[PDB]
A paper describes a structure:
We first asked whether a T/P containing a preexisting mismatch (G•T) can form the expected proofreading intermediates by the Polε–PCNA holoenzyme. Cryo-EM imaging and associated two dimensional (2D) and three dimensional (3D) classifications and 3D reconstruction resulted in two 3D EM maps of the Polε–PCNA–DNA ternary complex at an average resolution of 3.88 Å and 3.81 Å, respectively. Atomic modeling of the two maps shows that Polε-core stably binds to the PCNA and P/T, but the POLE1-CTD and the regulator subunits POLE2-4 are invisible, similar to Polε holoenzyme in the polymerizing state. Notably, the template strand extends to the exo site in both structures, indicating that the T/P with a preexisting mismatch cannot reach the proofreading state in the Polε holoenzyme when the DNA movement is highly constrained by PCNA. Instead, the T/P junction binds just below the Exo and N-term domains in the highly positively charged main substrate chamber, thus placing the holoenzyme in a blocked state. The Exo domain is distant from the thumb in one conformation but interacts with the thumb via a thumb-domain-contacting loop (TCL) in the other conformation. Therefore, the template strand passes through a gap between the TCL and the thumb domain in the first conformation but is blocked by the TCL in the second conformation. While the upper end of the T/P DNA substrate is blocked by Polε, the bottom dsDNA end of the T/P protrudes from PCNA by 6 bp. Remarkably, we found that the tightly coupled PCNA imposes such strong constraints on Polε that a T/P with a preexisting mismatch could not insert from outside of the enzyme into the exo site.
Residue numbers in the entry:
A (entry chain C), C (entry chain D), D (entry chain B): 1 to 261
B (entry chain A): 27 to 193, 213 to 1198
Write the structure that this text describes.
DNA sequence: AGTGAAAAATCTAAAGCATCACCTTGCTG
DNA sequence: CAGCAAGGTGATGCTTTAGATTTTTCAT
């Protein structure tokens, strides 16, 4: 048992559908704040943070801060019952190692259990540094994806520059260099289209085009991506799930030996 | 033109004076002399008219120890094909066009192989073109080859056009052949001279040519003067030895068991003395020591030593690659030309031969033809395996340490490799090749260096000239081939033997295994065993049934055994391992079936043979599976696009070259470009371009050819068995002689004994090389149809034996040589027979062998077989033969089968079978040891095989395997806690060979290229520039995320000063946040764990899972398909059908409309 | 001389889509009462019959009980051609060896005609009587697909157990299990969402749920499916397709043994 | 200096999307008349002609003729970044070694500058005769795409008949011959969904379906696609663009010779 | 501790297919 | 006037495959 209660299950299946590629196996932490997971990819270079608060859910039941060793690939094959509006129920786990997954249709007439055993996954612990970042680019994620997917298949590396007149995505690769620039939006009020760049000093960061291709595969989960950077620090990619969840991409900065400048 | 003749005559005088200073006195005095031929070389010798002319100088040894030579001149020649009624004109034209270059042109008939209606008496009239000399031969051949090529093309086009419509004068030449046959090959074929025979050379005066004749009654073989030189250079570590800067410090050689070592003083600090080394009493040699201040005096001492000894045979390890070029360059530094003192010369084939001496390479024998594994065909493993002692070995990288401080160790190593190659030569290789060239017409140089295809070529050369058969020329790889469906081809073959392993596990005589058993086959056995034993007595022993007394007793004993076995048709019983190896199916199938490549006709070409009566008796039909990969481009589309490409011009190969039309490009480049454009033309119009097709085809084998191939293999295996019986009786005589203890008769008997062994081994090896000749291209008598027919008929026999052992047990392993089976012991295999014959009173016939013999007699005996009886009246008798003899092996103690990791695909020739006494018996094609392989899995795998035979049941033997597996995983999961670092470091090295500078691969990334770049950035570029280096490396783990090529760190980073090593590993690690520099941590431990895991999956766990036994080791995972089959097998809720579980309404089938 | 007219060709499209990947060869047989599908599947484990009766065709006419043996692995490509609402005229002959299909556009603009080749067959036929079934359940087809196809991925076999409380689906596999529980509904207003169960005695049958994954793809035929079963008897999956006929899946269970201990 | 604006980016997206899968190179011809791309494909049995007239662009001018042969696969790979509503612009020089493409959003915020390496190859202008076609037929693009994808399954070639009544598709194969007949649908006020024929004399021509399945990749380019065909004359797919110029797909009809008849 | 070339088998990225979720739109309560 | 179902469309896992690449296998 002990599956977190929420009237909708669109996010609960789509976050795992997006996370299923970068991370094969991970561990889930339940605490009084809510559900959390810090995970590393296969090559152990990038960090993925998912925080979904219990107060961001409907209502909360728990027994203790507990770490659960559930895999993320084969387990993300039973979540296609829970559509965009299916209801979960939550209750404390007494003594069994099995975690269930109950799915309730909106008709409230058919339930379905999903009993999964637990295997021990040992995950390392660390403290992610936090600091004031030079530039944060907040911009809608659908066009971010449809530009990244079309500048990433021609090249292999990307260089981002934070500038007042425009942030530049240099696509360094074999076929050729191409780049996009984004100024400040001043004539659009609606948040679903406008781009803003809260920036203080210019900086250049280098990253992999495949990594930015796979990172932005969670587009239907969110609506606006923010990219946060400072002087040669890892990129922090924020997606916000309404006002109840946040996911962070924390890939390490692959700056070469003074190749940028 | 005169300068070339002057150079050739100077070369001839140099060779003659070299021969006179090596004691080969050219026979000029008249009279008789006895001799024993040892070598053969063409050399131009002037005739009586002071005119250029080629000759070959035979070298003869005499039993008293004095050599000589004899020159014989003859006219080099080939044959050409002429149109009908066009023999005189072409001969007259070519004689008038090259007066002074053609000695004699005339017609001579020779029977060909492909001519229609040819088996009635008509013969093809060829024409000889004989010249004065071999360079005239080369000039005329290269003058005529494009002419005859374009003539063949134009007559093919004209004939095709005329047949399509109906349904440098040089217009009569058709095809010129036997052009690449050497001169001395042609002489040894024509005048019938081989090597290793005794001849009565006659030479009266100088006017008459020398007269030679075989004298084979002197069966004793004299000893030629042999010499085994090997070298060593001043090699600095981690470097290819330089052919200019390095120079010899130490050589040794063995003149007929007498040792002589030659050493320098400027390298060796103190002098060395004579000594004796004896690991086995048969190997010995006293090593005479020569010491000289300078290396020029070293090479002069060797030169004058071989001048005063005159060694006809010289033998070496890797002569044509390392020894001769190095000593030649090193002597050319000091101004002693190798083409003036010894004789050997740089030839056009990259090889080295002397006009008078023999240059031998034991590596090429032990690699090509000793049938030893490819992973260990070097000299040290051949000394361990063949000769049976451990040779003295030393690391070449640190030879300078004991160049001064322990010169005795260096001297021992040099003399040990010298004595090893010498004794390995004289014991096996020397009598083997001389027995080979008793029937092979060439010097030991070529026949040692050629492939088995050329040896079988020489055999068919000999008997084809004997049978008056013109040779076929080597085939032409004719591109743009289209089959009946009208498609272009990429690669087409026959189908090989489908070597499988139908189930896997552990099978021993003590272990009671399952037997699922069909009683119907034993009903046949109960009703047929009398005929089975009758056939076994009348055919295997070739003894009629009237000469046995206890026949009924043993027959009823077999009846009782078979009935008692039959009473329980499902058993858990202890088997015996029974190896149904008929033994080289392919020669036996050619014997039974009479596959001749001359006619081997198909439809519309069979009607030529004029004795094809309606009672079709020569029509042998057999089936085989043709496979081919083709593009879908049909005749029409390919025709359209080839005209399309014809329409424009082509880019010239030369820079700023002129435009060339379609008719003057080379066929290879135009085929390459045509394939390149057709690939990406059909890539976007058919959705598929690589389509395989494996179809069934029936081909007919003519049964009344002149049949030189089947005759050679038949009479040749006949002489094999004759020499085998002669070896048996002479080995009995040898045992009697060594029990008696005499001196000279035991020596003569041992000489004849090793003669007969070398004969029979040569015969056997070339019998199982007749299949290697016909299997692949590069052969004149190359037919795809022999390979297909013989391979599929061998597969057919072996699979019928498989299915007829499946009903009487659990056959075990299926091969393209012979099945391995396990049988219930209730089958009889041996007894004591009582026969009326006094000389042979007992008969031991294995009953399963008898029943397989009788069923192959019933099924696959040639009843269509024909034979000549009298040639003039075309008397063809119809006979029947079956030599497919399933000789069987005794009950073997143990056998282990491995299994693959893929569904459908099954392993090719992998198993292991053990010897009854407790040792090992036989492997095949297996991963015990291989070049470019990690050393951990080899020692693990041999340890598992050798720690195996203890056990009582399947669970017990799998527990004993798990014992050593658990030991190895315990010592390998401990991260090498208390085991030596040097042993592990040598144990996990992986070596890859690179050459050809750096431009061979172009622009690509492999592990060898990555290590080449790693050494390029290590210290310099010159260590990557020089070719022929084997780089050693280990896969690391710390740069995670990079592919497998980037993480292959070499081992030169492990052989420097520790601080700069730390700098290099920080450079190649792309980070500097670490503080430790442990050698054990950087190693990719899990990579080696999963490699050992894949090995033990192939060898143990998956073979266990195909049996109904528990998983052997739980410390390793399993493939997902294996895990789901294991979980799906053991459920009682698995399958219930509907036909037998519920009633069906009846039988009904659909009709028209 | 066979003619079958159909104003709603989508149901024919859907039935021949629903069993393409099941069987290899189509052993149809036409008769005066209707067309039956007496086809034996290649894997030889289950049986399926379609019965198209004369009260659903716009124009139905036959001559005798003619058997049709066209290949069906070559069939759901011609029946992927017409739109969702074309007019299907399927024709055959007593003496001619060519099946004919005619698709008419609703607005009469895109008429299509398909010919066919014929060949003989040889495969057994099963005969099942009309025996009374213990537990009959009525299920909405969409929810039936949601449970069946999505338990087909967690599991390889399914347990259909009917007791007094309700019908349950206990499907197990290589990673975990799913225990679907059903609750009775009585105050329902419309029959496509109504679940009512006829009880005789508690039963329990094990099935290869992979075959049910083949089977459930007939969901868009009829909004209501009826599942009837007893002990040691092929379960029937019955689709009553809009008063055109009915499609029956007779699937053979697997016998129960005391392998628990 | 070459500066070309175009408000709608859809048509100059779809033209080179259709040109992408069939041609792997290009030879741009920028003249005073406009923009031309007359190219051969890999098979050298068909012709493609992109014509973009000068007056269709709002602002477009030239000073000399340029023949710059960049490949076409790379261009259609890089130009997929923007949408179908984005305003496109091409910027180049009189001797430019690398041109630039600006993609400005409707709100003039998402602005691009994408560039690639350029090469040159054989640039040839083959004869483009506008011979009087015997049969010219105009069909909606969706219906024609559906019918080509329809007939691609049955066989690998379609024979087309033009008559007084209309057009007749036919495709033969091992599934049987299927023929589809369309008459003039001049009974609707929408010419986009109607079909129109003009007719001289009846001919029957069979065409290869891999090349038609590559031709009709331009599904969204036009509301109606017209194609013209005559006896032994190449099929001319005249993709009509309402904004500027057109696209021409020329194919030599495949007719089998007497090698089998 | 040769090389040298074919080649059958093996590894990896590109394309074809049917499927799944979503966007758009017309008909009706 | 909006709710809901039907049709079109683009993204995606999966399987097939085509070209490069690697070890074998015999040729000198
Ligand atoms: S099969 Fe008989 S008739 Fe035909 S070629 Fe051979 S021997 Fe002559
Ligand atoms: Mg040597």
């Amino acid at each position: 048992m002990f599956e977190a209660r929420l009237v909708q299950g669109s996010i609960l299946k789509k976050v795992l559908e997006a996370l299923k590629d970068l991370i094969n196996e991970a561990c889930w932490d339940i605490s009084s704040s809510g559900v959390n997971l810090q995970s590393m990819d296969s090559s152990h270079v990038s960090l993925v943070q998912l925080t979904l608060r219990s107060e961001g859910f409907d209502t909360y039941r728990c027994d203790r801060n507990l770490a659960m060793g559930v895999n993320l690939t084969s387990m993300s094959k039973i979540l296609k019952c829970a559509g965009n509006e299916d209801i979960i129920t939550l209750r404390a786990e007494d003594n069994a190692d099995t975690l269930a997954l109950v799915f309730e249709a909106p008709n409230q007439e058919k339930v379905s259990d999903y009993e999964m055993k637990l295997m021990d996954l040992d995950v390392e612990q660390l403290g992610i540094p936090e600091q004031e970042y030079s530039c944060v680019v907040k911009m809608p994620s659908g066009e971010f994806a449809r530009i990244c997917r079309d500048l990433s298949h021609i090249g292999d590396a990307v260089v981002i520059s934070c500038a007042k007149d425009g942030v530049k995505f240099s696509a360094s690769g074999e076929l050729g260099n191409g780049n996009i620039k984004l100024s400040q939006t001043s004539n659009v009020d609606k948040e679903e289209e406008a781009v803003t760049i809260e920036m203080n000093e210019p900086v250049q960061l280098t990253f992999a085009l495949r990594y930015l291709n796979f990172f932005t595969k969670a587009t239907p989960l969110s609506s606006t991506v923010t990219l946060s950077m400072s002087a040669d620090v890892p990129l922090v990619v924020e997606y916000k799930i309404a006002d109840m969840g946040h996911l962070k991409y924390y890939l390490a900065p692959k700056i070469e030996d003074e190749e940028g400048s | 033109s005169s300068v070339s003749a002057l150079k050739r005559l100077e070369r001839s005088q140099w060779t003659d004076k070299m021969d006179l200073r090596f004691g080969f006195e050219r026979l000029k005095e008249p009279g008789e002399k006895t001799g024993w031929l040892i070598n053969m070389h063409p050399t131009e010798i002037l005739d009586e008219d002071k005119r250029l002319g080629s000759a070959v100088d035979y070298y003869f040894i005499q039993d008293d120890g004095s050599r000589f030579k004899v020159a014989l001149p003859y006219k080099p020649y080939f044959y050409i094909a002429t149109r009908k009624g066009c023999e005189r004109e072409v001969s007259s034209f070519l004689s008038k066009k090259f007066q002074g270059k053609i000695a004699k042109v005339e017609t001579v008939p020779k029977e060909d192989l492909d001519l229609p209606n040819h088996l009635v008496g008509l013969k093809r009239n060829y024409i000889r073109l004989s010249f004065h000399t071999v360079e005239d031969l080369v000039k005329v051949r290269k003058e005529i080859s494009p002419a005859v090529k374009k003539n063949r093309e134009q007559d093919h086009a004209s004939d095709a056009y005329t047949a399509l419509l109906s349904s440098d004068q040089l217009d009569n030449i058709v095809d010129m052949r036997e052009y690449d046959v050497p001169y001395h090959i042609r002489l040894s074929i024509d005048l019938k001279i081989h090597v290793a025979h005794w001849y009565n050379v006659r030479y009266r005066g100088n006017a008459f040519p020398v007269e030679i004749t075989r004298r084979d009654d002197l069966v004793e073989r004299p000893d030629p003067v042999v010499l085994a030189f090997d070298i060593e250079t001043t090699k600095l570590p981690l470097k290819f030895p330089d052919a200019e800067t390095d120079q010899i410090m130490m050589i040794s050689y063995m003149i007929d068991g007498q040792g002589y070592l030659i050493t320098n003083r400027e390298i060796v600090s103190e002098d060395i003395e004579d000594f004796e080394f004896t690991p086995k009493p048969e190997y010995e040699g006293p090593f005479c020591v020569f010491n000289e201040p300078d290396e020029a005096h070293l090479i002069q001492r060797w030169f004058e030593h071989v001048q005063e000894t005159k060694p006809t045979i010289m033998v070496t390890y890797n002569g044509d690659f390392f020894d001769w070029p190095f000593v030649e360059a090193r002597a050319a530094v000091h101004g002693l030309s190798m083409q003036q003192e010894i004789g050997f010369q740089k030839d056009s084939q990259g090889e080295y031969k002397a006009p008078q001496c023999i240059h031998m390479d034991c590596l090429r024998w032990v690699k090509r033809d000793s049938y030893l594994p490819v992973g260990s065909h070097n000299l040290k493993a051949a000394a361990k395996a063949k000769l049976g002692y451990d040779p003295v070995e030393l690391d070449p990288e640190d030879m300078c340490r004991m160049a001064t401080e322990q010169p005795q160790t260096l001297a021992t190593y040099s003399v040990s490799d010298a004595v090893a190659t010498y004794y390995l030569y004289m014991k096996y290789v020397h009598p083997f090749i001389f027995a080979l060239c008793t029937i092979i017409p060439m010097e030991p140089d070529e026949v040692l260096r050629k492939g088995s295809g050329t040896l079988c070529e020489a055999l068919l050369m000999v008997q084809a000239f004997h049978a008056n058969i013109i040779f076929p020329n080597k085939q032409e790889q004719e591109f743009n081939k289209l089959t009946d469906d009208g498609h272009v081809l990429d690669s087409e073959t026959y189908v090989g033997g489908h070597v499988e392993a139908l189930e896997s596990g552990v099978f021993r005589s003590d272990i009671p295994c399952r037997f699922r058993m069909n009683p119907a086959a034993f009903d046949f056995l109960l009703q047929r065993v009398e005929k089975t034993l009758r056939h076994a007595l009348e055919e295997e022993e070739k003894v009629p049934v009237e000469q046995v007394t206890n026949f009924e007793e043993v027959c009823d004993e077999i009846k009782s055994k078979l009935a008692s076995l039959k009473d329980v048709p499902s058993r858990i019983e202890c088997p015996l391992i029974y190896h149904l190896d008929v033994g080289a199916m392919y020669p036996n199938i050619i014997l039974t079936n009479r596959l001749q490549p001359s006619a081997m006709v198909d439809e519309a070409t069979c009607a030529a043979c004029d004795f094809n009566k309606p009672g079709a008796n020569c029509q042998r039909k057999m089936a085989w599976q043709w496979r081919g990969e083709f593009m879908p481009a049909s005749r029409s589309e390919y025709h359209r696009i080839q005209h399309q490409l014809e329409s424009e011009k082509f880019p010239p190969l030369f820079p700023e070259g002129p435009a060339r039309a379609f008719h003057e490009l080379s066929r290879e480049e135009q085929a390459k470009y045509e394939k390149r454009r057709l690939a990406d033309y059909c890539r976007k119009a058919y959705k598929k371009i690589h389509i395989t097709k494996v179809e069934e085809r029936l081909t007919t084998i003519c049964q009344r050819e002149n049949s030189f191939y089947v005759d050679t293999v038949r009479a040749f295996r006949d002489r094999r068995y004759e020499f085998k019986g002669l070896h048996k009786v002479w080995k009995k005589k040898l045992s009697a002689a060594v029990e008696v203890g005499d001196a000279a008769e035991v020596k003569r008997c041992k000489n004849m004994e090793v003669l007969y062994d070398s004969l029979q081994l040569a015969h056997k090896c070339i019998l199982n090389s007749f299949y290697g000749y016909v299997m692949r291209k590069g052969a004149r008598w190359y037919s795809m149809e022999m390979a297909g027919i013989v391979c599929f008929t061998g597969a057919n026999i072996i699979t019928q034996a498989r299915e007829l052992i499946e009903q009487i047990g659990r056959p075990l392993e299926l091969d393209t040589d012979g099945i391995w089976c396990v049988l219930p012991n209730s089958f009889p295999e041996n007894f004591v027979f009582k026969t009326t014959n006094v000389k042979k009173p007992k008969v031991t016939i294995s009953y399963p062998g008898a029943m397989l013999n009788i069923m192959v007699k019933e099924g696959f005996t040639n009843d269509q077989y024909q034979e000549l009886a009298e040639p003039s009246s075309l008397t063809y008798v119809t006979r029947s033969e079956n030599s497919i003899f399933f000789e069987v092996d005794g009950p073997y103690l143990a056998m282990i089968l491995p299994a693959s990791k893929e569904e459908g695909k099954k392993l090719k020739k992998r198993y292991a079978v053990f010897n009854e006494d407790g040792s090992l018996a036989e492997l095949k094609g297996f991963e015990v040891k291989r070049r470019g392989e990690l050393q951990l899995i080899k020692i693990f795998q041999s340890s598992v095989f050798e720690a195996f035979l203890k056990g009582s049941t399947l669970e017990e033997v799998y527990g004993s395997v798990a014992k050593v597996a658990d030991y190895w995983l315990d010592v390998l999961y401990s991260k090498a806690a208390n085991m030596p670092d040097s042993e592990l470091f040598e144990l996990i090295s992986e070596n890859r060979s690179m050459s050809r500078k750096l431009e061979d691969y172009g622009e690509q990334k492999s592990t060898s290229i990555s290590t080449a770049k790693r050494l390029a950035e290590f210290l310099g570029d010159q260590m990557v520039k020089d070719a022929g280096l084997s780089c050693r490396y280990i896969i690391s783990r710390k740069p995670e995320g990079s592919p497998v090529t980037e993480r292959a760190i070499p081992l030169a980073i492990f052989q420097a000063e520790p601080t700069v090593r730390k700098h290099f590993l920080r450079k190649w690690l792309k980070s500097s946040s670490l503080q430790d520099f442990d050698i054990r941590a950087i190693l990719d431990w899990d990579y080696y764990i999963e490699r050992l895991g894949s090995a033990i999956q192939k060898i143990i766990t998956i073979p266990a899972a195909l049996q109904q036994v528990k998983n052997p080791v739980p410390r390793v995972k399993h493939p997902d398909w294996l895990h789901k089959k294991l979980l799906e097998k053991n459920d009682v809720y698995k399958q219930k059908k509907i036909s037998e579980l519920f009633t069906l309404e009846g039988r009904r089938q659909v009709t028209m409309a």
